């Protein structure tokens, strides 16, 4: 399909066109405040379906457009947000066009311009480059659609199936959320960095808000230092925690190395060896056996470590083990839950 | 201070012990069905404190332990559950002894006896075994504590300061689950080695019943094994899967391998070289600049992967590179959000 998109430099614009020529095989023809009138005038007329995303005589671009479209033979469908309506029901019922008039509420997600005049993009961009931030009023409600509901809305309405709300089609997902709500959010997210915590992904609106605040990182500053505890016998470095479903770190033992040598009443834990062989052991608190289970990176499979038996894991190798550790709780100095016990 | 426990071979006496031996410097007089008349005596006679787990003449095993400690000088305390408590207030009355009476729920935790009705004990064993378990009524209130607030709240007993609700020494965090909740919860822990998912370890009942199965586990069943996607340039093996803190994987590179060239609306991810070295390259999809960080095992750091920046991974060393990735959902081959992109 021919498909046209006026203000194809703007914010959903950029966003659609990039996924419409990632996932479809349509002909995308892109118009934008400097495309010359021959190639306005070129497009329109063999579109299929045109995305409209852009008094002394001089008319609107917009009406420019319909006048222009009112010589397609095709009767091509046409889609747009109103914030002028009747004058578009008007249009449809005398020239034939089906035409979508959507309705949207303030918009946010990547390419969004910062500093002009997108609160959530000026916020983003701002927090990630430690810059004072203006917020006026933290109680303030906004009604938003995140940008992948706006362009997986379009992809319904150019197969001629949208989402209609009461009478009108109303792209789905819709939040409601404080600005105070918005910007603890984006400072969390920055603290996570030197936390090693999470977002709440089960929580649409914050995942979403997520994706956007990283879309605004500066280009130098991607990645971020993990504390690693370095001695002779290797290193142990934190990389995720969570409240809700534990933790994992990075274990480097050197080769002949020995750690561990303990039990825990409720911590339990997960091992999975992804470089060099070695073994893991177990002996329960009130018995004789000792348990090995050999392991290396050769076959990656997880040992539960299992509460009341005293464990320890070994380098077996020529080279440096690497074992990634899940454990069931953040750990806490005051009840770290960890008694030494051989064997 | 010398401590003696009665029932020291049952489920609490082993709990407690270990922990007593563990994490303070008293000693513990352990005494049980087969400890001799002497060896009793003895015992009782030297106590501080007495911790009781345990008609034609026969007298109790506790009023025999009453009648002995008649004669410690030293009134040490006794702390015991009521399941005849008048008799016990009369005997402190007479003879001194503060003595600390609770009213413990149901029990459950590691080294309960399986098949000797206790009902939780007897599924975890169950279930962990393959075996056909008994479901009498999943509708079934059960009032419960977790062992380690019994042993905790004895502790607090023992230096003067336990837990008193509404007149009685009263054992913190009973739970209240029913049958069905405790079985539903029993079988997910098993297909959790098959979906690599975890469990609600903010729901203290669910997280004190996680660590109570494990301890049910054969000792040859402690580990399982990873479903690793092998080829010619390497394996990638998911690892922990989760509906709210996304997922974390493994990523296996051989020597020269780039793998990637993707970007992704909304799916993000962090990536951490653990073993190897190589480059995470990046793109803005709109855009002429590639940006590369150089990473390795040498030095722990995270690179986060935002949204709209086509990414590559190279390995660049004569080793195997291993990456171990966080992506902010699960992956749903329906909706994958990647979308290919050179460089
Ligand atoms: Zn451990
Ligand atoms: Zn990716």
Chains 1, 2 share one sequence.
Request: aromatic share 10%.
């Amino acid at each position: 399909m021919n498909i046209v998109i006026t203000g194809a430099k703007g914010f959903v614009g950029k966003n659609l066109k990039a996924d419409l020529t990632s996932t479809t095989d349509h002909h995308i023809f892109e118009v934008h405040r400097q495309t010359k009138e021959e190639e306005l005038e070129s497009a329109l007329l063999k579109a299929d379906f045109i995305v409209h995303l852009a008094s002394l005589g001089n008319v609107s671009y917009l009406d420019h457009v319909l006048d222009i479209l009112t010589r397609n033979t095709k009767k091509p469908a046409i889609l747009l947000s109103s914030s002028g309506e009747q004058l578009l029901r008007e249009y449809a019922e005398e020239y034939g066009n089906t035409v979508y008039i959507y309705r949207w509420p303030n918009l946010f997600g990547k390419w969004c311009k910062p500093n002009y005049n997108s609160v959530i993009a000026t916020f983003c961009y701002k927090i990630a480059r430690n810059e004072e931030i203006q917020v006026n009023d933290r109680n303030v409600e906004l009604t938003l659609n995140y940008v992948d509901d706006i362009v997986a809305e379009i992809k319904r309405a150019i197969e001629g199936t949208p989402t209609i709300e009461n009478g009108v089609p109303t792209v789905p997902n819709v939040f409601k959320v404080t600005l105070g709500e918005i910007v603890d959010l984006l400072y969390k997210f920055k603290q996570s960095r030197l936390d090693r915590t999470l977002p709440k992904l089960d929580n649409l609106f914050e995942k979403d808000l997520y994706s956007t605040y990283l879309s605004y990182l500066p280009s130098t500053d991607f990645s971020y230092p993990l504390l690693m505890n370095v001695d002779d016998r290797g290193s142990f470095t934190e990389f995720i925690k969570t409240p809700d479903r534990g933790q994992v770190s990075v274990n480097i033992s050197k080769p002949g190395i020995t750690k561990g040598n303990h039990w825990h009443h409720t911590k339990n834990e997960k091992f999975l060896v992804v470089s060099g062989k070695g073994v893991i052991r177990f002996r329960h608190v009130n018995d004789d056996e000792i348990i090995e289970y050999y392991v290396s990176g050769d076959k990656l499979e997880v040992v539960d470590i299992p509460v009341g038996y005293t464990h320890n894991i070994e380098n077996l190798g020529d080279t440096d083990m690497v074992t990634i550790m899940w454990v069931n709780e953040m750990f806490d100095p005051n009840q770290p839950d960890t008694y030494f016990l051989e064997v």
